[PDB]
Amino acid sequence: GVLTESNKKFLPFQQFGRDIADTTDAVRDPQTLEILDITPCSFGGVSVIT
Amino acid sequence: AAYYVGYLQPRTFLLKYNENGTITDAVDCALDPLSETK
Amino acid sequence: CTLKSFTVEKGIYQTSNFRVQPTESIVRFPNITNLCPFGEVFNATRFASV
Amino acid sequence: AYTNSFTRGVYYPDKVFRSSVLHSTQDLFLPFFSNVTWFHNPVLPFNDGVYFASTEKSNI
Ligand SMILES: *[C@@H]1O[C@H](CO)[C@@H](O[C@@H]2O[C@H](CO)[C@@H](O)[C@H](O)[C@H]2NC(C)=O)[C@H](O)[C@H]1NC(C)=O
Ligand SMILES: *[C@@H]1O[C@H](CO)[C@@H](O)[C@H](O)[C@H]1NC(C)=O
Ligand SMILES: *[C@@H]1O[C@H](CO)[C@@H](O)[C@H](O)[C@H]1NC(C)=O
Ligand SMILES: *[C@@H]1O[C@H](CO)[C@@H](O)[C@H](O)[C@H]1NC(C)=O
Numbered sequence: 001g002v003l004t005e006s007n008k009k010f011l012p013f014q015q016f017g018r019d020i021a022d023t024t025d026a027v028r029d030p031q032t033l034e035i036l037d038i039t040p041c042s043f044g045g046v047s048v049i050t
Numbered sequence: 051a052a053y054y055v056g057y058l059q060p061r062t063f064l065l066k067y068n069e070n071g072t073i074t075d076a077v078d079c080a081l082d083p084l085s086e087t088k
Numbered sequence: 089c090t091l092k093s094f095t096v097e098k099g100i101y102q103t104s105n106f107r108v109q110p111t112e113s114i115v116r117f118p119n120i121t122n123l124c125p126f127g128e129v130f131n132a133t134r135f136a137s138v
Numbered sequence: 139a140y141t142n143s144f145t146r147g148v149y150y151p152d153k154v155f156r157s158s159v160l161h162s163t164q165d166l167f168l169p170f171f172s173n174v175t176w177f178h179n180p181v182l183p184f185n186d187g188v189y190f191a192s193t194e195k196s197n198i
Contacts, residue, residue, distance in 0.1 A: 010155055011071050017155035026155065030118040041108045048101050051194035054174045056143060058187030061169060063148075064162035071155045076148045078170045079162075 001038040008035055064088070139176035143168065147189045 008026055010017070017026035025038045066075040078085050090103055147168025168189045 009070070013153070014071060014155045015153040017071075017157075019156075020159065030116055041110070043105065043107050045102055046104045046106050048103055050096060050098070050101070051192075051196060051198060053177055053193070054141065054189075054191040055177065055182060056147065056168055056172060056174045056189040057185055058147075058166045058189065059169055060164070060166050062162065062164045063167050064160065065148075065151075067156045067159045067161070069157055071157060073148060073150065076145070081170055 001040050003036045004039065006035040006037040008037070010035060140173040141176050143170070143172040143174050145170050146191070 006026060008017070010026070010028055014028075016024060016028055019025055027036050027038065028034075029036055062079040064077040064079065065073050068074050077088050080086065090101065149167075151163050151165050166187050174189075174191075
């Protein structure tokens with residue numbers, strides 16, 4: 001994915017968050033206690049206008 | 051001084067998380083039929 | 089090559105998918121910790137017999 | 139010395155952070171509204187798990 005800085009606050013024993021559909025989005029960095037998010041890489045369909 | 055000792059069983063629970071990620075309420079599944087519905 | 093012909097009518101058509109490929113890999117294990125006392129063994133005062 | 143267990147013994151099943159989620163899980167737990175043995179010494183069977191609660195002020 002695409003890691004980025006996050007404004008979410010974890011809990012001091014908690015490792016990594018999840019979502020409603022059981023998908024991982026928030027991963028804590030192991031060394032630094034900064035919080036990182038996950039955004040999937042861009043994709044889509046290609047169409048031809050002719 | 052006083053102390054209480056119980057025991058643990060493998061029964062399905064339902065948990066309710068909050069905005070910060072703290073467990074605030076839990077419901078048993080095999081206690082009474084209303085909780086079975088829940 | 090999608091509509092198997094040489095003439096294409098006016099409209100909109102879907103051909104393929106657009107996708108972004110990853111650039112590199114980053115692995116961050118937990119911080120380092122309790123070492124093994126190997127230097128105690130080799131730099132000892134005296135060694136036992138066989 | 140039987141005492142009602144009320145609703146206690148709830149512990150975090152694993153290490154995941156969910157917000158406003160009603161996720162339900164299957165694991166070992168203390169049953170709701172059970173009987174616990176009030177004590178005031180001997181050996182006890184461990185079995186699978188145990189919910190040990192203590193009220194004291196002398197740390198003994
Ligand atoms: C492993 O842990 C040490 C100590 O927690 C980290 O060292 C700290 O790094 C921060 C980063 O800005 C500094 O502000 C502290 O002053 C450092 N403390 C010490 C005692 O050195 C170290 O960075 C961690 N390892 C990695 C790879 O990040
Ligand atoms: C979550 O944490 C914030 C931090 O101050 C606090 O204000 C809020 O009350 C907490 N939420 C609950 C449900 O306690
Ligand atoms: C023993 O001590 C010397 C002196 O510093 C050091 O260079 C050497 O690495 C030590 N031996 C081991 C096995 O670490
Ligand atoms: C606890 O023990 C009392 C006395 O024996 C009994 O009346 C009660 O039904 C018991 N509770 C449970 C949940 O078994």
